RNA sequence: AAUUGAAGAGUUUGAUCAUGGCUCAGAUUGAACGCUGGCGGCAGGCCUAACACAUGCAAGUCGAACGGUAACAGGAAGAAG
């Protein structure tokens, strides 16, 4: 019931007195399929064991999401560095239709049908960043009529 | 009951993030070309030279408008084997 799967692998690099030393960074997201979802980042020197530090990451620093009945609530625009993300519940608007990065995320936070569209840079480091900040400000009709009184 | 509706990726760098262009994945067509080709249904078929046109048809009808008889078939009368 963990539900961990892996978006991007990049080999970065450092440039040493001699030659240039390669490093691999992971990013991965994890999410129980019920709100629950976080992502992990994690680098090391080769790959097998920069995914496990970024699922060891991912595991911990984990965020609640306020679902609906299988989807989002309202229409939710989450911004990161570059990257602008745009998301609509689709009352069951069958199936997950995201962008590369958000696909995962959306996959394994327990969401099943949205619509998205992606704008801006859509570097995925940055695209969650802006699917969690989006599903993270997206709040629910018991918590609005909570702070509104009814 | 009559709008259930939105996906990205590759490439600037030793690597990064951003900006930014180029390019690809889709759908479409009065299409052409290449290879191949069994049947049917429904559609479509000079986008260019509003260039030049052989030949055949594409606008005739009415005698219940009229003088009339060129034919065709009868009618009447005459003459002949």
Do not use: C
Not at 95 to 113: D, K, S, T
């Amino acid at each position: 019931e963990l539900q961990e799967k892996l978006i991007a692998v990049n080999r970065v690099s450092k440039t040493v007195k001699g030659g240039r030393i390669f490093s691999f960074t992971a990013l991965t997201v994890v999410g129980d399929g019920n709100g629950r979802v976080g992502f992990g980042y994690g680098k090391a020197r080769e790959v097998p064991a920069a995914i496990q530090k970024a699922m060891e990451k991912a595991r911990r620093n984990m965020i609640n999401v306020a679902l609906n009945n299988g989807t989002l609530q309202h229409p939710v625009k989450g911004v990161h560095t570059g990257s602008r993300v745009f998301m609509q519940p689709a009352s069951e608007g069958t199936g997950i239709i995201a962008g590369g990065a958000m696909r995962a995320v959306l996959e394994v936070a327990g969401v099943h049908n949205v619509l998205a569209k992606a704008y801006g840079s859509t570097n995925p480091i940055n695209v969650v960043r802006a699917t969690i900040d989006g599903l993270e400000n997206m709040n629910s009709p018991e918590m609005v009529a909570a702070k509104r009184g009814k």
